[PDB]
Amino acid sequence: VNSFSGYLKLTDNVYIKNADIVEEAKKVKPTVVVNAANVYLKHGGGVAGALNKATNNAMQVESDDYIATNGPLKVGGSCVLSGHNLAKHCLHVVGPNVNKGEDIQLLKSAYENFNQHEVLLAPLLSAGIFGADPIHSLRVCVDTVRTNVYLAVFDKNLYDKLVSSFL
Ligand SMILES: CCCN1C[C@@H](CNc2ncnc3[nH]c4cc(F)ccc4c23)CC1=O
Ligand SMILES: [Cl-]
């Protein structure tokens, strides 16, 4: 039993809720919140800009030190950093950016990072401002992630369409 409330069960291990991931993180304080990161950990907008804003820019400060030490992530890759006031940890995961022509096949590699964590609160990787079809992102999540994932979807119409078109 965990504290995730009001989720609609999609599969054995995948659950979904109409919620802003930022507000959901503040309420639940999960062990792991996933950020929809880019390779430079520049948290300007989307999930990343919103999470970072909720940390009062502490996520960005930490991220800049990470990049100065380690260099950029790979598309499809991830790193674990602090969750600040939102979660114990933040798993920064880089899905491909379709607007920049990045390989959509890398979306599966991106979701594989979730399997290193038993339970996660997460957005739909590569969706939103990253340019991919959210219905496809949900499908890849279900067919790749084996650990327990709680997906927060910001947009109500999108949440409704994601649920309705699933089985
Ligand atoms: C029109 C479609 C909106 N999108 C794009 C996809 C990813 N975005 C997010 N996913 C979950 N929580 C979120 N909080 C946010 C706060 C923000 F300022 C900006 C973005 C998000 C966000 C799912 C979704 O609903
Ligand atoms: Cl977004």
**For residue 107, what is the domain's CATH number?**
3.40.220.10
57: alpha, beta or left, given left = phi > 0 and alpha = psi -120 to 50?
A: left
For residue 140, being part of any structural domain is answered with yes
Count of beta carbons in the 10 Å neighbourhood of residue 142: 17
Are the CB atoms for 150 and 17 separated by under 8 Å? yes
Residues with CB under 6 A from ligand 1: 20-22, 46-47, 50, 123-124, 127-128, 134, 152-155, 158
Q: Identify the DSSP state of 104.
A: T
Ligand 2 ion: nearby residues, β-carbon < 5 Å:
46, 128-129
For residue 109, being part of any structural domain is answered with yes
CA of 106 to the centre of ligand 2 (A): 18
> By residue range, what is the domain housing residue 87?
8-163
Which sign does the torsion angle of CA 102, 148, 85, 62 carry?
Answer: negative
For residue 143, being part of any structural domain is answered with yes
Torsion of CA 152, 65, 88, 19, to 10 degrees: -10
For residue 1, being part of any structural domain is answered with no
CA of 155 to the centre of ligand 1 (A): 7
For residue 80, being part of any structural domain is answered with yes
**What is the spatial order of strands in the sheet that 148-153 belongs to?**
8-9, 14-18, 148-153, 119-122, 32-37, 89-94, 78-82
For residue 135, being part of any structural domain is answered with yes
Q: Which ligand is nearest to the CA of 130?
A: 2
For residue 3, being part of any structural domain is answered with no
State the method: X-ray
In total, how many domains does the chain have? 1
For residue 2, being part of any structural domain is answered with no
The burial class, CB within 10 Å (0-12 / 13-18 / 19+), for 167 is exposed
79: phi then psi, degrees, rounded to nearest 5: -145, 155
CA of 49 to the centre of ligand 2 (A): 9
